[PDB]
């Protein structure tokens, strides 16, 4: 009902906080050339459509993606709402959204869903990526008290704890993306209650530069993608 | 001023939906297959009374010529959701691409509408679980599952109602990557003959496919470039054929 | 009292809106049963009339409405929710007629109807209305017809459908009439013999003879839903009388 | 003016033709009916808030007898905190 | 919302301060109608639009108004079809047609000949861009519609039948005749399928980049 | 209001406890942030929790807040509030001057910003904000420093050296000993190295904890570095290690 | 900046191609759909913002790009939404159905009437001495080089022959798997 608890806290938030901390976890790693994400997926379903397009991960433009810890249905809301501005910004200065100006925007909404009494807050924890000109490769964090930071690697979601300590010792500011690809998926089978990570258990992207000078590409791994930097990293459920 | 409803519970629960999935668990079966050429969605007709006729109790909808609809809970809720799902296929899509919008796309919208209804003051979540399934030129086939929390899921085969876990371990065990329409309709009649509460016949049974395009349901000729109907729904007579070949 | 469970229309663990449940004994404070069957051209709707005191006029003590040219009601419950709910039908068939260039079918007034409950029956601040509504017609399209709505916004078409406190011996009479006689509708050609056969089933299921004043019936032809006046009804209670 | 002569009329079609409808109803059923109407409009309209969604309200369509009918205003179609003090007075 | 009118002062100052404004396309020739014998028959010389599988239109006057009036009442006319559960009457489209031509007071240039079969038979009107509605056995719009309403008058007798039909609209199309220039026609008859008929009747310097 | 005073036991009125008390809880619990003004300058400090070792500091943001060219703004209590709260007050700055011919003025930046916080305060189940500022700059073709403190009951008071949230009692003490209102500090260089004294008893660890802005005439607005905020720290150590050496026994 | 200008459409065997006048293309892309615009370049721009804009998103919306005959019904679609004010522009969409290889080029006035001649289009003031040279130079289902020679010797043809030094054009020819840009000068 959006009211302070008697120390200065609010119980709304605290209890979104408590459902995002059940809700699958999500690594990413900001490499010197690149950008990985990755996320882990509950399918206790055999009938579920694994090989759907997404559920964790998604674009907001041509040099932006999100990971998603919470609520799927809240999610894709401010999803929405965040690809509308970053093209009415392209629109209106016929340049790409920068990342800071987007993942603040999507900060200042999920903090007034938690000030007005007759809206409850979004249960959603979103780990930014892209690239821009003004700063380069970044990797933000945003969370349902609309509190927002930047990361070099940030995990959101279930295990967050063990997930941070395991990338604090790996890390490296000088790595490249190759490395960052090892390292979340390393992190990621370190982290896991699954006895063993997989193609279909496992959401996988990248946002590298390629080989000629003006791209970024934005690769949200397919299946088949995600089997051949398993096999090839040495996490290799092989045959 | 301390005014909405399905706020979180302590444990990070939103409580009122938790509910409204009670109402969902204790309606009449509805179920879905997706095949290689086609889908099927199916469901009983639960009367009243035997001087009611059921065939103005419609529980499995037409959306769009290649999208069908089923729910399980409160039809009431069911009635009012497909009548906006169908304004929505036009208004939003057909009004500005001059085609129907793609099973994902009117799954969100439907979606969008049940979420506004848990995240409101003054008025409760829906009672219904919602199959929706169709065919689009890029994606192909598809099968989707809408609960009262404006969460929607792909799936393979589903049930939803009284007897949808035991529906949900018959389609684990027999839904396999390589059936045809004519398979996934002779499994969605044996999963209804186990869920039944009343008589089994084609008189008290629901079944919809979206399919091959039927050129004779769009009750004009001249224009090959208009396909015609991928959503049909079995007549009573075919029900019984195909309930004699049980 | 679980608080605001029981008070506004809200889910409760179970998943039960007391606001309707409740709304289902508001439409036997009547105390009065209804009966409507289809004849071959007709529909007919036949309704226990109660005037106790001395001082009504029996003339004012009305459950049945004309709702345009061709569809008529019975109505079961409260009658300050039974003119409510009448007086919208009226506007509904009106607006339709209006707007699409032909008469009203009594399945999308039935809908309509049905779909404003619903409203009730979701709102936290709308309560559902203490009736159920009984509307009968001679559609073009569908023939005599019979369509019943409720407070939970529940519709469904029937062939006999009954609404009173009384209403199961009633039900369970016309069901074993229409299990041995295996047509959908009774077979006379005239009205006469319709309001005459549901005169005769609903004496036979409330175990009293009725007088004329204490009877009430409607005819649905094509063209005309009309209400008969006590001489009409005495008519047939004669020949009720001339038979047996 | 040089402002297009349907412009005026298109703008406030909705409201002019419930207004309209409004008073044929107090006219033909007497001051209940609008009454009624208004009261369940109120109660719709008023508690039914969300600062990202404005396409209109699934109630509002059954009561405005438009759950099956489209207006081009319905295909073409045209901040929290801002929304949050409107709602609430400043 | 709905039709804008932005550059309403925009192309104001435009047309005044001498650009071209682009000529809206206007089918202008001759559409025609037939009650026949169990049916109803329409033609143009692209042209006919549907309302519905039963329900046709011939369109004279803007071409895009045509094409988007009857589309949006072909969307309000399924829409009702899946509310009521029943085919979609002429009686319904026409009031519709009719009363949104009135909303929008002939600034939409769409003029309308109307036809179709439904429940309860077979139907002809049409409709003129003010919202003003004519009924008849056969009617016509378009440039040719004197010398088309005096062949069809000329020929036209209860129990016509489809071929004869056919023939009447076919000479009277022909009678506008001496964009467009062929016939297509649209049969309705009361047990059947709405038919529909077409046409009845080293140089320079060079440098090259690739792109996506 | 509180406490021990009470008649024939007690009863409650509408009255002191209070969503505005918990708010004020929630500012209690925000970074220390302190403001001094000199005699032709104002700094504006600030507590960073020590950074994460995985954090990315060239994008973090700044903490004091820049409003308009001559106007800045710190903080205690919830950042999220914040963000919304100096959001309002940078396009109430902007539209002052688009509408006004003149840019806003400190104290009408002041006026505005607890204004806005008194309005969530007074009534409907919408909360205040969790948030205390110190609101400091110049007035336009003037000489005078200008240092505003705001409160989530949108009470605001005028200081020459204030601090909010976190430990902020042995800091308010401190300005009391070193702080002389007739002789402030007399250039910028004296007024840092005052608030980096103040500011050395409260942090976490030193150098990395301080940041600090300092605002003068004419739209000089100046952010100091890590490295240069370093040379003050290892400056004002090198007099701790003088002061201890110069004991005489 | 030039008000006007021309632009042609013209389709081949599994191939398309759109001519136009530069001395800022009146040929965007979006994916494999390409749209010439004449007319006032204020709407050519606006409209290229709008497109962009839809586009984008539904791309991002719908996991796949936007097909010629769907952008045909979106852009007739957006331009007749502008009807008591439109655009100045004479749009001419084209491109290859990625699912099916069939060629596409359809043209529109100001509030979006749909031409879809299944040979070639044209576009601008002036138009019908092109109309006249596209008619004499076509033949049906040419090679993608005698498809480029066509459109090119016809954009030369009726250019003014009294400012060829003022001349340039770029010919876009589209492709299953490829799009070639020439520009072309004299």
Not at chain 1, 191 to 196: E, F, G, L, N, V
Not at chain 2, 177 to 197: N, P
Not at chain 4, 78 to 89: C, P, R, T, W
Not at chain 7, 66 to 78: M, W, Y
Request: glycine share 8%.
């Amino acid at each position: 009902t959006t009211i302070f608890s008697p120390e200065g806290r609010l119980y709304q938030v605290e209890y979104a906080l408590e459902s995002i901390s059940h809700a699958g976890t999500a690594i990413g790693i900001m490499a010197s050339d690149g950008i990985v994400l990755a996320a882990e997926r509950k399918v206790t379903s055999t009938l579920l459509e694994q090989d759907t397009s997404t559920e964790k991960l998604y674009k907001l433009n041509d040099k932006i993606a999100v990971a998603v810890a919470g609520l799927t249905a809240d999610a894709e809301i401010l999803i929405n709402t965040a690809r509308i501005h970053a093209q009415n910004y392209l629109k209106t200065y016929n340049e790409d959204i920068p990342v800071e100006i987007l993942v603040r925007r999507l900060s200042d909404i999920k903090q007034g869903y938690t000030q007005h009494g007759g809206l409850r807050p979004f249960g959603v924890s979103f780990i930014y990526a892209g690239y821009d000109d003004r700063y380069g490769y970044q990797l933000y964090t945003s969370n349902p008290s609309g509190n927002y930071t930047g990361w070099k690697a940030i995990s959101v979601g279930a295990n967050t704890s063990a997930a941070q300590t395991l990338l604090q010792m790996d890390y490296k500011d000088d790595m490249k993306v190759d490395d960052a690809i090892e390292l979340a998926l390393k992190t990621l089978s370190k982290t896991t209650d699954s006895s063993a990570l997989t193609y279909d258990r496992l959401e996988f992207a990248t946002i590298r530069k390629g080989a000629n000078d003006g791209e970024v590409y934005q690769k949200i791994f397919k299946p088949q993608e995600i089997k051949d930097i398993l096999v090839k990293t040495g996490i290799t459920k092989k045959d | 001023y301390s005014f909405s409803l399905t706020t979180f519970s302590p444990s990070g629960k939103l409580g009122q939906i938790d509910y409204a999935l009670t109402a969902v668990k204790q309606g009449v079966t509805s179920l879905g297959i997706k095949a290689t050429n086609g889908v099927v969605i199916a469901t009983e007709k639960k009367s009243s009374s035997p001087l009611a006729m059921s065939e103005t109790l419609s529980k499995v909808s037409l959306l769009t010529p290649d999208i069908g609809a089923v729910y399980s809970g409160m039809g009431p809720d069911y009635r009012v959701l497909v009548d906006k799902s169908r304004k929505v296929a036009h208004t939003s899509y057909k009004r500005i691409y001059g085609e129907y919008p793609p099973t994902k796309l009117l799954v969100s919208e439907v979606a969008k509408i049940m979420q506004e209804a848990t995240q409101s003051g003054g008025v409760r979540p829906f009672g219904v679980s919602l199959l929706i399934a169709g065919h689009d030129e890029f994606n192909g086939f598809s099968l989707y599952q809408v609960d009262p929390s404006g969460s929607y899921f792909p799936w393979k085969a589903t049930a939803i109602g009284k007897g949808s876990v035991a529906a949900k371990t018959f389609l684990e065990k027999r839904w396999n990557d390589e059936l045809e329409l004519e398979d996934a309709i002779h499994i969605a009649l044996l999963t209804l003959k186990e869920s039944v509460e009343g008589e089994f016949n084609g008189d008290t049974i629901e079944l919809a496919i979206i399919g091959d395009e039927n050129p004779d349901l769009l009750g004009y000729t001249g224009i090959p470039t208009d396909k015609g109907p991928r959503f049909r729904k079995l007549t009573s007579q075919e029900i019984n054929d195909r309930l004699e070949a049980l | 009292a679980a608080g605001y469970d029981r008070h506004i229309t809200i889910f409760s663990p179970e998943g039960r809106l007391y606001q309707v449940e409740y709304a289902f004994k508001a439409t036997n404070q009547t105390n009065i049963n209804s009966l409507a069957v289809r004849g071959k051209d007709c529909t007919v709707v036949i309704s226990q009339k109660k005037v106790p005191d001395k001082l009504l006029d029996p003339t004012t003590v009305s459950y049945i409405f004309c709702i345009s040219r061709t569809i008529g009601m019975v109505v079961n419950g409260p009658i300050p929710d039974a003119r409510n709910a009448a007086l919208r039908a009226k506007a509904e068939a009106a607006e339709f007629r209006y707007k699409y260039g032909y008469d009203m079918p009594c399945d999308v007034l039935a809908k309509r109807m049905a779909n404003l409950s619903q409203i009730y029956t979701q709102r936290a601040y709308m309560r559902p209305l203490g009736v159920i509504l009984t509307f009968v017609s001679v559609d073009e399209e569908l023939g005599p017809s019979i369509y019943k709505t409720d407070p939970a916004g529940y519709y469904v078409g029937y062939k006999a459908t009954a609404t009173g406190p009384k209403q199961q011996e009633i039900t369970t009479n016309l069901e074993n009439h229409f299990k041995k006689s295996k047509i959908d509708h009774i077979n006379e050609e005239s009205w006469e013999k319709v309001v005459e056969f549901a005169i005769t089933h609903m004496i036979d299921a409330l175990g009293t003879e009725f007088s004329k004043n204490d009877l009430e019936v409607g005819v649905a032809t094509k063209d005309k839903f009309f209400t008969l006046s006590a001489e009409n009804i005495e008519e047939r209670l004669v020949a009720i009388a001339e038979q047996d | 003016n040089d402002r297009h002569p349907l412009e005026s009329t298109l703008k406030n079609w909705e409201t002019t033709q419930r207004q309209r409808q409004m008073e044929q109803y107090r006219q033909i059923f007497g001051i209940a009916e609008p009454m009624k109407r208004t009261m369940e409009m109120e109660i719709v309209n008023r508690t039914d808030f969300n600062p990202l969604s404005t396409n209109g309200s699934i109630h509002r369509d059954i009561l405005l007898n438009k759950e099956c009918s489209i207006d081009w205003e319905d295909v073409y179609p045209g901040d929290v905190h801002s929304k949050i003090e409107k709602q609430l007075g400043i | 919302a709905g039709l804008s009118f932005d550059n309403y002062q925009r192309n104001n100052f435009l047309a005044e301060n001498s650009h071209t404004q682009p000529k809206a396309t206007s089918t202008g020739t001759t559409i025609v109608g037939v009650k026949f014998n169990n049916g109803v028959v329409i033609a143009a010389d692209a042209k006919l639009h549907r309302i519905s599988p039963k329900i046709w239109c011939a369109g004279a006057g803007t071409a895009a108004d045509t094409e988007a009036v009857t589309q949006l009442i072909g969307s309000n006319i399924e829409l009702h079809s899946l509310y009521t559960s029943r085919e979609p009457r002429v009686v319904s489209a026409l009031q519709m047609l009719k009363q949104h031509l009135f909303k929008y007071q002939g600034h939409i240039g769409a003029y309308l000949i109307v036809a179709g079969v439904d429940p309860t038979g077979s139907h002809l009107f049409s409709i003129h861009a003010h919202g003003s509605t004519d009924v008849g056995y056969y009617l016509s719009l378009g440039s040719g519609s004197l010398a088309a309403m005096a062949v069809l008058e000329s020929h036209w007798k209860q129990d016509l039948t489809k071929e004869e039909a056919i023939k009447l609209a076919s000479d009277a199309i022909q009678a506008g005749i001496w964009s467009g220039s062929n016939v297509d026609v649209c049969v309705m008859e009361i047990g059947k399928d709405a038919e529909y008929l077409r046409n009845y009747l080293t140089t320079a310097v060079l440098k090259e980049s690739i792109v996506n | 209001m509180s406490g021990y005073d009470r008649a024939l036991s007690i009863f409650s009125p509408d009255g002191h406890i209070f969503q505005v008390e918990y708010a004020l809880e929630a500012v209690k619990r925000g970074t220390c942030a302190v403001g001094v003004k000199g005699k032709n300058c104002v700094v504006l400090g600030c507590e960073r929790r020590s950074t994460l070792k995985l954090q990315d500091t060239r994008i973090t943001p700044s903490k004091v807040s820049k409003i308009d060219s001559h106007v800045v703004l710190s903080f205690s209590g919830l950042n999220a509030d914040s963000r919304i709260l100096i959001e309002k007050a940078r396009v109430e700055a902007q539209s002052h001057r688009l509408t006004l011919e003149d840019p806003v003025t400190v104290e009408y930046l002041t006026r505005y910003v607890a204004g806005v916080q008194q309005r969530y305060t007074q009534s409907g189940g919408v909360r205040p904000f969790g948030v205390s500022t110190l609101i400091a700059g110049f007035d336009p073709r003037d000489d005078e420093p200008k240092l505003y403190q705001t409160e989530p009951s949108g009470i605001y008071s005028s200081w020459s050296a204030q601090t909010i949230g976190r430990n902020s009692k042995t800091v308010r003490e401190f300005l009391e000993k070193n702080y002389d209102r007739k002789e402030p500090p007399a250039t910028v260089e004296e007024c840092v190295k005052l608030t980096v004294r103040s500011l050395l008893e409260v942090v976490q660890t030193g150098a990395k904890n301080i940041e600090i802005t300092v605002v003068k005439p004419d739209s000089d607005i100046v952010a100091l570095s890590s490295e240069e905020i370093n040379q003050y720290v290892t400056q004002i150590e090198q007099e701790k290690q003088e002061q201890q050496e110069q004991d005489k026994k | 900046s030039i008000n006007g200008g021309i632009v042609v459409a013209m389709t081949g065997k599994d191939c398309v191609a759109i001519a136009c006048d530069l001395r800022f293309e009146k040929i965007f892309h979006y994916g494999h759909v390409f749209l010439g615009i004449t007319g006032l370049a204020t709407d050519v721009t606006t409209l290229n913002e709008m497109f962009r804009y839809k586009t984008n998103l539904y791309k991002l919306k719908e996991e796949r790009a936007i097909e010629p005959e769907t952008f045909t019904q979106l852009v007739s679609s957006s331009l007749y939404e502008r009807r008591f004010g439109p655009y100045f522009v004479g749009p001419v969409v084209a491109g290859i159905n990625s699912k099916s290889g069939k060629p596409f080029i359809a043209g529109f006035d100001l509030i979006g009437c749909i031409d879809e001649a299944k040979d070639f289009i044209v576009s601008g003031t002036a138009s019908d001495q092109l109309f006249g040279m596209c008619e004499s130079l076509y033949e049906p289902n040419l090679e993608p080089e005698d498809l480029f020679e066509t459109i090119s010797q016809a954009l030369l043809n009726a250019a003014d022959r009294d400012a060829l030094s003022g001349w340039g054009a770029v010919v876009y020819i589209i492709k299953k798997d490829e799009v070639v840009k020439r520009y072309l000068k004299m």
